[PDB]
């Protein structure tokens, strides 16, 4: 019954629980304050012996996935999609420097295998901390990310793929006559506290020019950025770092503008 | 063998890293410092509900760095590197923009100047985040508090450095009662790491850093691009944040090549 744009919440599972995303609803009965929860974050690692990238989960990320039944399914039951973000991890392998289509495809299978095993709704790409060049890896090239996303989308035609619009991967979305922009569901501004339209050939309904960090970004700014989201006709609103505290006022700061309603907490 | 180029600045999170790393990077051509200004991040503004009076608060690590200034600070100053103390909100309602009166703002300013002199610092940096205006029965930001505080502070230290992290309520409230305090600052920089945003402040370009980079997270190519744009366009400051204890020779040289025409070298 809620109508406005799609709300997104990155959660740093190293410090906080995914379930807090589901504790905020709209006073006027519209539904959840948040539409998408993102687990931050899995990693892309490099195995120097085999000279091969692989998907890696730290102790915290692995705990959330292993406990998907208490840590994920309840959000999904409420209607909240859950994604896994993937980040560089200082080992030289990154989303933009796969040496070949087959190599990018091997990684896509690992991502899609993880989405399937743990019942996830999709994946989010964050191309930072890769440290391209460590362990004798190559610098970014023009084809790696297009190959990777092309394979992932073929693997998961029904799942969400989203882009944290930063890093070398973000500027390499077209290769060999294929622009993979329409293979993403969403793209959003990575600079928390600011408004910045992603220059990506995706419709406005799937873009978040605004990005805020709950608990740090001024409530004045949260509200203004959500008002601009609606005013200019955009369809996504990115938030990061919701914790376990009482953020009713922080959340209401944008639910007031996105949905015309204030937020209430479940406990 | 002197260095010609914009003044580079290094925010150091002392909760995790030592100030001394800032002095560990010199230029391969001439041996000047890669970094001209180190900023201890960060002291706090607390409220104290009894007195109803804001006070300068140091956390365990900041207190340790200041108490041990002889080994953590003086070596940098003796190497020619100025050392500033950042001040940040701390969730207790008092912030730089909601002092109720000139007198109370002047009282907090005396605490800052006193601490500058006691520990032999070179000045103070303002970061107006996390204050949580309204907590403990505090007021919302007003138009006068920050002008009063900066006027009193500059009166206390005519010879010291006062810098502005360009974010938060205080950074839009620089004029009141016929007094514009823009020229009372020595520097003002973009808070949005990874980006280029010229502060809209009535300071000369030589005292502005539109560039902001996080060492170890911002891509080296972005570090270099922003450093090149700083020289082009003619700005006088280049802000870096979060230098750690690892070997960041390639990250530092990424900007020193463009700022000063020379690679950096560690130890
Ligand atoms: Mg689509
Ligand atoms: Mg395109
Ligand atoms: Mg700025």
Author numbering:
A (entry chain A): 9 to 275
B (entry chain D): 8 to 274
How does the study describe this entry?
By engineering a protein that dimerized through a highly solvent exposed disulfide bond, a system is created where disulfide bond breakage leading to monomerization is easily measured by SAXS. In this way, SAXS was able to follow a residue specific rather than a global damage process and link damage pathways seen crystallographically to those occurring in solution with much lower X-ray doses. The X-ray radiation induced dimer to monomer transition was pH dependent, suggesting mechanistic processes, routes for further interrogation, and mitigation strategies. Here, our system is engineered so that the reduction in scattered intensity is from the dimer to monomer transition through disulfide bond cleavage, making a global damage indicator into a residue specific one.
Comparison of the elution profile of endoHCYS in size-exclusion (SEC) chromatography shows that transient disulfide bond formation leads to dimerization in approximately 75% of endoHCYS (60 kDa theoretical, 53 kDa experimental) in solution. The protein crystallized in space group P21221 with four monomers in the asymmetric unit. The monomers have an average RMSD 0.289 +/- 0.016 Å to the original monomeric structure, indicating that the cysteine containing fragment did not affect folding. The cysteine containing fragment and disulfide bond are un-resolved in the electron density but is not unexpected due to the deliberate placement of the disulfides in an accessible and already flexible region. The position of the N-terminus indicates that the disulfide linked dimer forms between monomers across adjacent asymmetric units, yielding dimers with chains AA', BB', CD', and C'D. This arrangement with the N-terminus of adjacent monomers positioned in close proximity is not seen in crystal structures of monomeric endoH. The distance between the modeled N-terminal Val-8 on partnered monomers (13 Å for BB' and AA', 7 Å for both CD dimers) is such that the length of the introduced fragment can satisfy the gap and connect the monomers. Aligning the dimers shows slight differences in the inter-monomer orientation, which is most likely due to crystal packing. A PISA analysis of the interfaces within the asymmetric unit suggests that there are too few interactions between crystal packing oligomers to for those interactions to form in solution. The difference in the location of isoscattering point in calculated and experimental scattering curves suggests that the conformation of the dimer is different in solution, perhaps through freedom crystal lattice restrains to rotate around the flexible linker.
